[PDB]
């Protein structure tokens, strides 16, 4: 059973004892620090505070086993016994802490207050940071949700120029990352989050989360297809590779099916057998269950082209009226290797030089989606900017001579409005002036209670592109 | 509660329609495909097996629950609910599949086999593949482990050049990654691999981990220190820095302590603060409670080269014997930004070029210890090999045409010494042929049961440097 008496960083155990004696009131925010990904998804927060933060949470049992095991960790006993015990004793194990947040799914650009956190009782002032290693956490799904939509944006762009149209854009980037994440419980956040911009995932994981964390009127918030593997090709044998083709495509002859190609030579697979052998097979296909060839090696953009060139060749290719080629409506591309915001771009801008509509692709992406990002992505950052000692509140900060990026907001922090509609984070408390407005956050968490919460649903409109929201 | 027919690739679900017709056996295997990493620690498979594989995994509640969410998400009835039943009432809900593995611990160059997987029953031809998913995250602690084995490498051979020996080596990169892994479940796998090679973690998470899984002689696995962050320093006061040192070194005056120096001036800190105004404080500490003074930012190796020379003014420094300076004792340093393998050679090469020992130094990495990384790295992989169709073995591989460096291996597997004592995977089941020695891989799983472990302390000597031999 999870234990957040264990589940902060070590020298935490010790910050009790380090703060200035008298000290009341700890106050200190989270945001994804300024100085490509201007703005950001704020998603995840409310996982981590169902989870992991609400009710009770603080047994004697829990106590026990967090001071056994700190007094062999340190070689010592310096772990706060008393503060824990309090905690369980005053507020039957629920915290006493308040947290407010930008609601979860809004865009907001870099170096804006996402959530801060207080403790709402003076003896727990030790509280407010012991929290950070888990609320920090919660750079995983933002910078997830991030990368995701900044991939639909590109998408978005370069369908809408080689189409008229963005019909399908959140099929476009399927997420294959459950076997290249770092865990079960990564692979159930990280397909969340990708969700919040798209709906094809085969990270079956991410369903269960949603439905138990956010909810959406849907039965599902992600959808697959039938797909073959290199295991269900290679099986048959070497000389059987359109043996594989024919028996697989005739097993899901009426709904749409992905089949790996490259397993030996993907030219002659998409020339020869698809293109030749197999024809017959393909072009009776509905509209609605199209064959997807699947290259999965070479350079990307190259064997994108080149497999684009072929089966162009090979079945009858029309002209939308952008002028861009499409393959016939029974018959698409996915292309699911090396996959990354950076090769989604090439491989989009080099389709539409050679004109070929984005119509005719759709991408897989597993590392690059949900593994090869880290928390220096977005500079996703938790620091303290307010305390309490002797009944006088001061604005505290860091700011390192030698790097000023590195530099924290000052004070009590409110988020607001501008004249011209943008977001502007006030420090110092200056919010109260109420010249800016209402502050922008809400309480989110209070006392061991979630306060305030939203569906998946609320959370994809709020993280919609401009482009879409252009009606 | 974890279902384990919820836990794979979607795709997967519809794959006992796509092999041949007649197939009663897939065979399948991990390697860390060749084309620095040229060999690697193999660990984490025991946690998966005991957490995730054994035992009862299947039953008509977990059945049902998967149909109903698998109707929805394909929008079409494609569901091996008979194959899962056969599972279910023949083997009491147990995997009837057999892996065998390379003990954990073990350091093999890339392109050997680690390990296997086949179904035992025919009918379960479906299932080796099913799981490839969740065995193939084992990935994430072999990266780690051996990500972490390599950076060891590197502050072993400057410790030994330097000093002359390597006391101390085990504490010398520890584990600041907790805030910067993606998840609570991938922080205590991550941290356990790195303790595979250090005894340095604030990850807690790891400590249980290992206990549960694994087991060590000792109490825990991994230790700590006293501390500052940001905010310790911070609360007192942008004019009192001092007062917040002062404090908390008292508070900790006979254990070792870190403070975060670089909130204002790291620089002022080190030259006016530590080095002057609170020198004695320092000068009286004990060898077994050092302060250990913690730069944050700035160019990681100008900094801590700056950092060095402001000390070595300011406190008594000696020359070791074999030419290199050495602060006293009771004072010394952290590097815990922006350190990860390429950074950490940078820095204690740096230092030797100043004629640093790096018994001045440690280092501490977050995410470049648990996060910056990603199955691509070493290339972990698994791939079917071996299949039986109407009674007769072939040998199975793929082979694309615009990457060799793909190509997998053909039929049964097996691992050998070589006469030099090197490693060989032989393919097409010619270890049958015994002209080897004995397969090096072990049954650790059958039948739903963890057939054979490892303790904790067995896999960090597997996992031993050659220089420490
Ligand atoms: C539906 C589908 N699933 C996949 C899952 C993982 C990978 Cl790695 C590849 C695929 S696909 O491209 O065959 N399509
Ligand atoms: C053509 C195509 N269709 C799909 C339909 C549904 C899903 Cl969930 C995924 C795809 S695709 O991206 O493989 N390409
Ligand atoms: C000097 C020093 N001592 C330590 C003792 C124990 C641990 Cl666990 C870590 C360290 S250090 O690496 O911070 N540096
Ligand atoms: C003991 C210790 N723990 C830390 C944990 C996380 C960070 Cl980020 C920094 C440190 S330390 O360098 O203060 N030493």
């Known amino acids: 059973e999870f234990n957040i008496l264990l589940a902060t960083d070590s020298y935490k155990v010790t910050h009790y004892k380090q703060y200035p004696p008298n000290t009341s009131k700890v106050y200190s925010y989270f945001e994804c620090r300024e100085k490509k990904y201007e703005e950001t998804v704020f998603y995840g927060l409310q996982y981590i505070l169902n989870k992991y933060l609400k009710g009770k949470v603080v047994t004697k049992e829990k106590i026990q086993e967090a001071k056994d095991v700190y007094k062999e960790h340190f070689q010592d006993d310096v772990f706060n016994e008393k503060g824990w015990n309090y905690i369980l004793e005053k507020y039957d194990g629920h915290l006493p802490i308040e947290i407010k947040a930008v609601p979860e799914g809004f865009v907001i650009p870099r170096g804006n207050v996402l959530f801060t956190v207080e403790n709402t009782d003076p003896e727990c002032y030790w509280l407010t940071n012991w929290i950070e290693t888990i609320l920090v956490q919660s750079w995983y799904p933002i910078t997830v949700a991030t990368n995701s939509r900044e991939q639909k944006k590109i998408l978005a762009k370069y369908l809408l120029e080689t189409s008229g149209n963005l019909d399908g854009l959140e099929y476009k980037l399927h997420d294959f990352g459950y076997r290249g994440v770092s865990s079960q419980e990564t692979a159930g956040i990280g397909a969340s989050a990708h969700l919040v911009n798209f709906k094809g995932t085969d990270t079956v994981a991410g369903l269960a989360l949603i439905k ?17 593997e290199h295991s269900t090709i290679t099986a048959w044998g070497k000389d059987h590779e359109k043996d594989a083709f024919e028996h697989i495509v005739t097993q899901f002859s009426s709904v749409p099916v992905s089949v790996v190609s490259d397993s030996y030579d993907i030219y002659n697979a998409c020339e020869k057998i698809w293109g030749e052998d197999l024809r017959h097979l393909i072009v009776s296909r509905s509209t609605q269950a199209p064959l997807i060839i699947r290259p999965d090696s070479g350079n990307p953009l190259d064997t994108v082209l080149k497999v684009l060139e072929i089966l162009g060749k090979k ?63 977005l500079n996703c950052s938790f620091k303290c900017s307010y305390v309490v000692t002797n009944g006088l509140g001061i604005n505290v900060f860091k700011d390192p001579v030698a790097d000023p990026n590195k530099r924290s907001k000052k004070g009590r ?52 592109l401009n482009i879409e929201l252009e009606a």
């Open 212 to 228: 138990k964390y956010y909810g959406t009127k849907d039965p599902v918030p992600g959808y697959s297809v039938p797909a073959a």
């Open 315 to 377: 079945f009858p290719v029309t002209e939308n009226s952008k002028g861009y080629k499409l393959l016939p409506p029974y018959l698409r591309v996915i292309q699911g290797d090396g996959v990354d915001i950076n090769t989604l771009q090439e491989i989009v801008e080099g389709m539409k030089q050679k004109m070929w509509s984005i119509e005719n692709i759709a991408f897989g992406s597993g590392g690059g989606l949900l593994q090869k990002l880290t928390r220096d992505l």
């Open 413 to 464: 922090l409110s988020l607001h409005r501008t004249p011209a509609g943008n977001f502007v984070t006030l420090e110092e408390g200056k919010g109260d002036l109420e010249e800016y407005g209402q502050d922008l956050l809400h309480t989110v968490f209070k006392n061991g209670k979630v306060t305030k919460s939203y569906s998946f649903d609320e959370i994809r409109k709020n993280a919609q």
